[PDB]
Amino acid sequence: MKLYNFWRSGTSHRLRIALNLKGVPYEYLAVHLGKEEHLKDAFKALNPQQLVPALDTGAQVLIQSPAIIEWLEEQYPTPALLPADADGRQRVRALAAIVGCDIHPINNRRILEYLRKTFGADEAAINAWCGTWISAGFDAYEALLAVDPKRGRYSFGDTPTLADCYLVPQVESARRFQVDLTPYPLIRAVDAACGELDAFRRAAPAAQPDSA
Amino acid sequence: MKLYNFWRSGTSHRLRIALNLKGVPYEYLAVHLGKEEHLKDAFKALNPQQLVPALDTGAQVLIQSPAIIEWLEEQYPTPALLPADADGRQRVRALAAIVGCDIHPINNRRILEYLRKTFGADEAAINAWCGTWISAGFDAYEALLAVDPKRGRYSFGDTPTLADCYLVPQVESARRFQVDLTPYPLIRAVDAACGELDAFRRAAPAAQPDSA
Numbered sequence: 001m002k003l004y005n006f007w008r009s010g011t012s013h014r015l016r017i018a019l020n021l022k023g024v025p026y027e028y029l030a031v032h033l034g035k036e037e038h039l040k041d042a043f044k045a046l047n048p049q050q051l052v053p054a055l056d057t058g059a060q061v062l063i064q065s066p067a068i069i070e071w072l073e074e075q076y077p078t079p080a081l082l083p084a085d086a087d088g089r090q091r092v093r094a095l096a097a098i099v100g101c102d103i104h105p106i107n108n109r110r111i112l113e114y115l116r117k118t119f120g121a122d123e124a125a126i127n128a129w130c131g132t133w134i135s136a137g138f139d140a141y142e143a144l145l146a147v148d149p150k151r152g153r154y155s156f157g158d159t160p161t162l163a164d165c166y167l168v169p170q171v172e173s174a175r176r177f178q179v180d181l182t183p184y185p186l187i188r189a190v191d192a193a194c195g196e197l198d199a200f201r202r203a204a205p206a207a208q209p210d211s212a
Numbered sequence: 213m214k215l216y217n218f219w220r221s222g223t224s225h226r227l228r229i230a231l232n233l234k235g236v237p238y239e240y241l242a243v244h245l246g247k248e249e250h251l252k253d254a255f256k257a258l259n260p261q262q263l264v265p266a267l268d269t270g271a272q273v274l275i276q277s278p279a280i281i282e283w284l285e286e287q288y289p290t291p292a293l294l295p296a297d298a299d300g301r302q303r304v305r306a307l308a309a310i311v312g313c314d315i316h317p318i319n320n321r322r323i324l325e326y327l328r329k330t331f332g333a334d335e336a337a338i339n340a341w342c343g344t345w346i347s348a349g350f351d352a353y354e355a356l357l358a359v360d361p362k363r364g365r366y367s368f369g370d371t372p373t374l375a376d377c378y379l380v381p382q383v384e385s386a387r388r389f390q391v392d393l394t395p396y397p398l399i400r401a402v403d404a405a406c407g408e409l410d411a412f413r414r415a416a417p418a419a420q421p422d423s424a
């Protein structure tokens with residue numbers, strides 16, 4: 001297994017947590033987004049979409065972190081990252097999708113570049129943009145954590161799930177874009193509890209080979 | 213079941229197709245996005261995130277169309293919208309995630325409103341934005357359809373899948389934003405094949421009760 005990814009990438013960080021929780025070994029292959037190595041014909045051979053991450057399983061190159069992570073859950077049952085019952089699965093998947101659909105893609109490099117080059121945005125306007133979508137997404141996420149009475153230390157129950165895999169990288173991203181997280185005690189408690197776990201610690205951007 | 217949705221909403225349309233394919237009956241409850249009925253406290257009681265669609269199952273209100281659809285596939289097995297094998301699953305999920313993560317959310321109403329109100333974007337700039345992310349996502353989607361040797365009429369195999377549930381609304385949106393689809397014959401052929409099916413036809417925005 002070869003993971004084509006980038007240290008500060010939220011989607012890379014997402015897949016790293018899932019892989020580490022499953023204890024699946026993989027070779028770390030850095031694809032430097034700042035250098036735009038993903039925008040080159042060489043990387044297009046691996047991923048036509050030209051985004052990270054991409055996972056070479058040995059037999060094939062897989063794309064889309066959400067699809068890869070669902071794949072890992074089935075290919076590597078232990079520990080389970082999705083609950084067994086329909087209602088629980090739907091809720092974990094919804095919490096994940098708040099991050100995966102409604103926060104992360106909006107703050108992606110290509111988007112911020114568009115805002116800079118087409119809309120003349122300076123860095124303060126970039127940070128105001130990222131904070132808008134994060135705050136909106138975290139508002140909804142936090143509200144959902146509040147109403148779940150059976151919830152323990154993490155997003156759902158008292159074991160780490162897919163939802164935590166999506167949430168942790170997003171909280172890190174929020175801190176990079178200087179998003180004030182005071183209004184989200186519950187998300188911050190989930191993030192800190194996750195931060196105690198080896199799988200999460202090893203996956204963090206600063207622990208990566210290509211870190212600054 | 214009650215479906216809180218909007219006729220031209222791409223995610224609403226996505227969910228409608230899945231519900232129609234599963235032959236599951238629901239009450240159509242319109243939530244007018246142009247009137248911003250979703251931004252009112254009344255809708256926040258149903259969905260704290262304040263987006264459409266939301267599905268009241270009688271017993272609970274479900275949010276996040278990707279999660280709801282994965283829920284329907286488990287709850288209502290026939291006809292199968294995900295293949296049986298892991299590699300097939302992952303690939304259908306990846307195609308859906310290109311649309312669900314990397315196209316649709318970028319062109320959402322709230323985002324375009326932000327471009328208008330913060331960056332002073334006019335409609336031509338709005339259309340140039342929307343086409344940028346659609347063309348980028350469709351480039352990758354189309355490339356994947358081309359490299360699948362055993363593909364029939366649809367995105368994967370020769371039965372409709374979740375991927376088609378995501379693709380068709382996106383193609384409709386592409387047409388609303390005047391995106392030139394000449395470069396995507398394979399996507400256009402998948403869409404035309406889907407448009408032959410009762411389930412898709414009934415789900416089309418123009419066929420909805422709150423349509424113009």
Ligand SMILES: N[C@@H](CCC(=O)N[C@@H](CS)C(=O)NCC(=O)O)C(=O)O
Pocket residue numbers: 009010011012033038050051052053063064065066105108109110111309310313314
């Ligand atoms: N849905 C994709 C999203 C991939 C994605 O957007 N990756 C970002 C890194 S977090 C990227 O490659 N950005 C490069 C760019 O914006 O040019 C996935 O989760 O795999």
Ligand SMILES: N[C@@H](CCC(=O)N[C@@H](CS)C(=O)NCC(=O)O)C(=O)O
Pocket residue numbers: 097098101102221222223224245250262263264265275276277278317320321322323
């Ligand atoms: N990930 C969500 C996305 C929902 C979403 O963004 N819905 C749009 C309609 S396609 C919406 O409600 N937009 C209202 C707005 O932008 O203010 C889902 O699939 O349920």
